[PDB]
């Protein structure tokens, strides 16, 4: 065999594999053997070379090269490719043979000072106060202090009704006591009618659904007076043991919020650092490599009908393809920047840790934690999709330690 590189175009490189002489025959052999192991003619195991081509015309040739090419993958296995090798031209002559493959090595990255891009963070201490302040306030409302009232049901009271729904001729179908807090002048269903009503009053509402009429008798059972209890140490008691002081309840609620923050905000920063890698990234990539991934994508859209709607919202299909282009270039930059820095820093997701995340997706998937682990060891497709993501959320984390975290104060 003999391999020569015709042209190099950034990451796109094209190879020429010329075989010929006898290894053409050594395959021809392999060809005859495997072929002699298949379909037969009105000619067992003794068929030579002649027979075949003067019968299964042409095919032989195809099947030969197929063994010639086998001798290629082992030239290209220690190279990482952003696109499986594509065989441009192939051809077989009696004495020599020549195959040409196009190789798309991973494109060369150039980063550029992680400290340049800024991510936004909302003032922690100043957002937790906001949280508690509002949490207590929601806690009061639940522990509404009420007493029965004999007045009309002005706004802010709590009326309790018992709603019965009758069939189109009497058969009572359901009965359920609802209760409402009258919202300062409200157009809510039913409740707007309970406004200004006193105990023992009834409000009938008739209704028709696909031909059949249904009656709704709403009877006011009781009207209490709401007055939310003051923010004291008593409010703590009101929500069980453990806390004895207000300062203590608040403590708990702060702890509860820092929890939710540290998770949600951390995730946000990650998100937006990723949004923005391409600014500081620059790669050498063959126009064609891109232009391919473009087709490798557009096509795979028509495979769900999606392309039709999608295309039909931009000015021209060429502008889409155009938007779709850079769209990918940016992602590969990212993806690429991740993969790289992950090696330079020796960051890797080990087997034991790859299980650690899998069990985190068992509740959301709605499955037994073990079925996940069943599926991860067993499949090598969900295995790798899950794997890389895990690594990604790691590399980002690291990088987030170099970026400019801009801190903003709560608006709401």
């Amino acid at each position: 065999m003999e391999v020569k590189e015709l042209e190099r175009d950034k990451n796109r490189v094209v190879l020429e594999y010329v075989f010929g002489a006898e290894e053409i025959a050594q395959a021809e052999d392999k060809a005859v053997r495997y072929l002699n192991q298949r379909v037969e003619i009105p000619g067992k195991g003794r068929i030579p070379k002649n027979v075949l081509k003067m019968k299964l015309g042409e095919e032989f040739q195809e099947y030969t090269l197929d063994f010639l090419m086998d001798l290629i993958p082992d030239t290209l296995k220690d190279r990482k490719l952003i696109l499986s090798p594509i065989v441009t031209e192939r051809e077989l002559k009696d004495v020599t043979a020549r195959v040409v493959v196009e190789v798309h090595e991973e494109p060369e990255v150039r980063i550029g000072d992680i400290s340049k891009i800024e991510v936004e963070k909302v003032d922690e201490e100043k957002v937790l106060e906001k949280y508690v302040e509002r949490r207590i306030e929601d806690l009061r409302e639940s522990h509404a202090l009420l007493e029965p009232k004999e007045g009309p049901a002005e706004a802010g009271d709590l009326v309790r009704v018992n709603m019965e729904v009758y069939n189109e001729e009497g058969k009572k179908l359901t009965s359920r006591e609802y209760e409402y807090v009258i919202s300062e002048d409200e157009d809510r269903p039913f409740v707007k009618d309970l406004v200004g009503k006193k105990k023992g009053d009834v409000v009938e509402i008739e209704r028709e659904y696909e031909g059949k009429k249904y009656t709704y008798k709403l009877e006011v059972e009781e009207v209490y007076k709401r007055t939310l209890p003051e923010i004291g140490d008593e409010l703590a008691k009101s929500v069980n043991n453990e806390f004895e002081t207000l300062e203590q309840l608040k403590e708990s609620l702060k702890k509860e919020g820092k929890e939710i923050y540290d998770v949600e905000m951390k995730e946000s920063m990650r998100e937006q650092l990723l949004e923005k890698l391409p600014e500081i990234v620059e790669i050498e990539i063959s126009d064609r490599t891109l232009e391919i991934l473009v087709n490798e994508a557009i096509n795979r859209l028509k495979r769900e009908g999606r392309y039709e709607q999608i295309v039909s919202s931009y000015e021209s299909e060429e502008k889409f393809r155009e938007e779709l282009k850079e769209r990918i270039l940016d992602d590969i930059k990212r993806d690429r920047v991740i993969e790289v820095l992950a090696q330079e820093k020796g960051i890797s997701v080990n087997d034991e840790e790859l299980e650690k995340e899998a069990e985190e997706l068992a509740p959301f998937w709605g499955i037994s934690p073990d079925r996940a682990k069943s599926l991860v060891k067993a499949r090598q497709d969900l295995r790798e999709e899950l794997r890389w993501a895990i690594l990604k959320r790691k590399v980002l984390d690291l990088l987030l330690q170099e970026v400019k975290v801009k801190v903003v104060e709560p608006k709401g």
Partner: protein
């Protein structure tokens, strides 16, 4: 579900109207407007591109293709993967962009929204997790495609 409801007053787009139409709480419109068109203002600030167009391509991305619905065949609870097409998806996305934006930290909703629409615009965010989330157990609950209805 979903019908030929007329475009919002500003952008002549059926979809933004559906988005406003979703963020709405109770029946309080003319308020959601101020958010939606406002999250559009933040989006052009943080991209310098046409928001209405970003929104489209953002929702388009969240549009899922399959899901799972619980069934009962003698006993109770069986996981049926089904495909998702037509108005269902387009709605399901919005129902997720907006829905996820609600249950957040931050402070305002105008902001939470831009935050999703943009993240979704860049194929990340909890919005999309739901998308590919079911989608992964789509090729998990694969063996029960014959219970399909």
């Amino acid at each position: 579900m979903g019908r030929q409801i007329p475009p919002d007053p500003v952008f002549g787009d059926v979809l933004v109207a559906k988005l406003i139409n979703r963020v709405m709480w109770d029946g309080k419109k003319t308020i959601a407007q101020k958010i939606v068109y406002g999250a559009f203002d933040i989006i052009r600030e943080k991209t310098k591109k046409d928001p209405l167009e970003v929104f489209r391509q953002a929702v388009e991305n969240v549009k899922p293709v399959l899901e799972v619905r619980p069934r009962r065949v003698g006993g109770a609870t069986y996981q049926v993967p089904i495909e998702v097409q037509e108005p269902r998806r387009t709605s399901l996305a919005l129902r997720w962009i907006v829905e996820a934006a609600r249950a957040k930290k931050g402070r305002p909703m105008k902001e939470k929204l831009a935050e999703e629409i943009i993240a979704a615009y860049n194929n990340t965010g909890t919005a999309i997790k739901k998308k590919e989330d079911t989608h992964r157990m789509a090729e998990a609950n694969r063996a029960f495609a014959h219970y399909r209805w």
